[PDB]
Design an enzyme around this catalytic site. Structure first.
Site, PDB file in Angstrom:
ATOM      1  N   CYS A  76       0.772  -1.284  -0.073  1.00  0.00           N
ATOM      2  CA  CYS A  76      -0.090  -0.086   0.012  1.00  0.00           C
ATOM      3  C   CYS A  76       0.928   1.393  -0.005  1.00  0.00           C
ATOM      4  O   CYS A  76       0.205   2.330  -0.123  1.00  0.00           O
ATOM      5  CB  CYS A  76      -0.901   0.095   1.409  1.00  0.00           C
ATOM      6  SG  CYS A  76      -0.321   0.775   2.609  1.00  0.00           S
TER       7      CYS A  76
ATOM      8  N   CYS B  14       7.189  10.032 -15.795  1.00  0.00           N
ATOM      9  CA  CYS B  14       7.931   9.839 -14.904  1.00  0.00           C
ATOM     10  C   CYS B  14       8.308   8.235 -15.213  1.00  0.00           C
ATOM     11  O   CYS B  14       7.273   7.544 -15.501  1.00  0.00           O
ATOM     12  CB  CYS B  14       7.832   9.910 -13.430  1.00  0.00           C
ATOM     13  SG  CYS B  14       8.430  11.804 -12.959  1.00  0.00           S
TER      14      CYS B  14
ATOM     15  N   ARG C 199      18.393  -4.984 -15.022  1.00  0.00           N
ATOM     16  CA  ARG C 199      17.828  -6.731 -15.111  1.00  0.00           C
ATOM     17  C   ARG C 199      16.934  -6.734 -16.239  1.00  0.00           C
ATOM     18  O   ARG C 199      16.183  -7.633 -16.360  1.00  0.00           O
ATOM     19  CB  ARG C 199      17.477  -7.168 -13.730  1.00  0.00           C
ATOM     20  CG  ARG C 199      18.309  -6.723 -12.606  1.00  0.00           C
ATOM     21  N   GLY C 200      16.485  -5.659 -17.035  1.00  0.00           N
ATOM     22  CA  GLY C 200      15.521  -5.588 -18.144  1.00  0.00           C
ATOM     23  C   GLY C 200      14.201  -4.979 -17.618  1.00  0.00           C
ATOM     24  O   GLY C 200      13.438  -4.967 -18.392  1.00  0.00           O
TER      25      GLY C 200
ATOM     26  N   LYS D   6      13.727  -1.530 -19.465  1.00  0.00           N
ATOM     27  CA  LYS D   6      13.539  -1.643 -20.641  1.00  0.00           C
ATOM     28  C   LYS D   6      12.098  -2.243 -21.096  1.00  0.00           C
ATOM     29  O   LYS D   6      11.424  -1.991 -22.254  1.00  0.00           O
ATOM     30  CB  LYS D   6      14.551  -2.463 -21.518  1.00  0.00           C
ATOM     31  CG  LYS D   6      16.053  -1.711 -21.679  1.00  0.00           C
TER      32      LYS D   6
ATOM     33  N   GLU E  27       9.065  12.468 -21.427  1.00  0.00           N
ATOM     34  CA  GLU E  27       9.059  13.799 -21.085  1.00  0.00           C
ATOM     35  C   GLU E  27      10.680  13.879 -20.428  1.00  0.00           C
ATOM     36  O   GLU E  27      11.148  13.136 -19.986  1.00  0.00           O
ATOM     37  CB  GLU E  27       8.257  14.037 -19.606  1.00  0.00           C
ATOM     38  CG  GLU E  27       7.836  15.466 -19.459  1.00  0.00           C
ATOM     39  CD  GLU E  27       6.919  15.829 -18.473  1.00  0.00           C
ATOM     40  OE1 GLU E  27       7.184  16.269 -17.365  1.00  0.00           O
ATOM     41  OE2 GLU E  27       5.565  15.354 -18.679  1.00  0.00           O
TER      42      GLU E  27
ATOM     43  N   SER F 133      17.083  10.484 -16.677  1.00  0.00           N
ATOM     44  CA  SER F 133      18.286  10.125 -16.021  1.00  0.00           C
ATOM     45  C   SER F 133      19.501   9.792 -16.781  1.00  0.00           C
ATOM     46  O   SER F 133      18.776   9.364 -17.907  1.00  0.00           O
ATOM     47  CB  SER F 133      18.017   9.292 -14.773  1.00  0.00           C
ATOM     48  OG  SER F 133      17.475   7.909 -15.257  1.00  0.00           O
TER      49      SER F 133
ATOM     50  N   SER G 140      18.789   1.886 -26.225  1.00  0.00           N
ATOM     51  CA  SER G 140      18.959   0.672 -26.499  1.00  0.00           C
ATOM     52  C   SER G 140      17.507   0.091 -26.888  1.00  0.00           C
ATOM     53  O   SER G 140      17.337  -0.747 -27.809  1.00  0.00           O
ATOM     54  CB  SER G 140      19.281  -0.049 -25.242  1.00  0.00           C
ATOM     55  OG  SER G 140      19.003  -1.562 -25.197  1.00  0.00           O
TER      56      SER G 140
ATOM     57  N   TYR H 133      21.563  11.661 -45.639  1.00  0.00           N
ATOM     58  CA  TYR H 133      20.770  13.126 -45.653  1.00  0.00           C
ATOM     59  C   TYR H 133      20.809  13.507 -47.115  1.00  0.00           C
ATOM     60  O   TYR H 133      21.904  13.728 -47.691  1.00  0.00           O
ATOM     61  CB  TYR H 133      21.402  14.179 -44.584  1.00  0.00           C
ATOM     62  CG  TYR H 133      20.506  15.255 -44.342  1.00  0.00           C
ATOM     63  CD1 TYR H 133      19.163  15.065 -43.654  1.00  0.00           C
ATOM     64  CD2 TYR H 133      21.155  16.506 -44.505  1.00  0.00           C
ATOM     65  CE1 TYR H 133      18.558  16.229 -43.378  1.00  0.00           C
ATOM     66  CE2 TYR H 133      20.099  17.592 -44.079  1.00  0.00           C
ATOM     67  CZ  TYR H 133      18.855  17.438 -43.689  1.00  0.00           C
ATOM     68  OH  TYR H 133      18.087  18.433 -43.183  1.00  0.00           O
TER      69      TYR H 133
HETATM   70 CL   LIG Z   1      16.716  -2.146 -18.193  1.00  0.00          CL
HETATM   71 ZN   LIG Z   2      -0.355  -1.511   4.100  1.00  0.00          ZN
END
Ligand SMILES: [Cl-]
Ligand SMILES: [Zn+2]
Ligand SMILES: [Cl-]
Length: 265
Positions: free
Chosen positions: A38, A136, A146-147, A150, A170, A174, A183, A226
């Protein structure tokens, strides 16, 4: 003052990377404690212990929008679950520098006998004007590389695909965010260029990736020419396959089965 610097969640202890705006009386404790289910945050081990034995939640509080083996994803509305998404965000802010009601939150979990354990999440604007299909995104530190990250990215674009729209996260991302996106983008585009004569607008329509994001990835892979103010796909299938063996672009270990996604635009 003192900030929150350490949290306890399920069985992990995690140092903080960033200021997160918990109330003053919470930042002053040596450590902080939460439901892994929770997400209530607490000041003492003793009140954590009481809560562990009382909390009935064994999974996130929304609709389980995806399921395959022991991997499940939960769709959680910002209006319908204000407090949960408020605690999610303050949890997020310890590891990200980047009101919850305008947002929907997608909770990545791996499940076992005890419940659906949170691994990472991403949020997104219910309706985005600049077409940001991710607001986010975050893999919890003990789960990074660990994937899972991705996987979250792959899930956000499959949502966009079911939506007849292209999207883009957005900014800013990071350092991990940058890495994970190049990747994912590269792997997706190369595999397309491995089988299929297609334009950039066409690649964008298949993948919900913006053309600027397509262009810069193929740019990075040196697979676009190009010509008179136009970007043009130009790739040898040899160099295609060479890039796929790169650990930077190797297939992610865990993948989104579109059959196993039961979502409605
Ligand atoms: Cl990843
Ligand atoms: Zn709880
Ligand atoms: Cl840590």
């Amino acid at each position: 003052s003192k900030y929150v610097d350490k949290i306890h969640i399920g069985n992990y202890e995690i140092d903080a990377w960033y200021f997160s705006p918990f109330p003053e009386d919470y930042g002053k404790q040596p450590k902080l404690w939460l439901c892994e289910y929770c997400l209530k945050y607490m000041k003492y081990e003793k009140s954590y212990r009481f809560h562990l034995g009382q909390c009935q939640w064994r999974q996130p509080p929304g609709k389980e929008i995806y399921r395959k083996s022991n991997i499940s994803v939960y769709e959680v509305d910002g209006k319908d679950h204000k407090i949960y998404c408020q605690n999610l965000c303050l949890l997020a802010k310890l590891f990200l520098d980047h009101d919850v009601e305008p947002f929907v939150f997608y909770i990545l979990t791996e499940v076992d006998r005890q419940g659906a354990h949170i691994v990472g999440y991403f949020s997104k604007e219910k309706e985005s004007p600049d077409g940001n299909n991710v607001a986010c995104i975050l893999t919890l530190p003990p789960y990074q590389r660990r994937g899972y990250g991705k996987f979250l990215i792959a899930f956000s674009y499959e949502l966009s695909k079911l939506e007849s729209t292209v999207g883009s996260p957005e900014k800013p991302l990071s350092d991990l965010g940058k890495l994970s996106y190049r990747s994912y983008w590269s792997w997706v585009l190369l595999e397309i260029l491995r089988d299929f004569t297609l334009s950039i607008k066409d690649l964008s329509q298949m993948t919900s990736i913006t053309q600027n994001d397509i262009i810069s990835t193929l740019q990075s892979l040196n697979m676009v020419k190009y010509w008179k103010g136009q970007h043009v796909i130009c790739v040898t299938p040899k160099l295609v396959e060479e890039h796929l063996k790169s650990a930077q672009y190797k297939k992610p270990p865990i993948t989104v089965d579109s059959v196993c996604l039961k979502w409605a635009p």
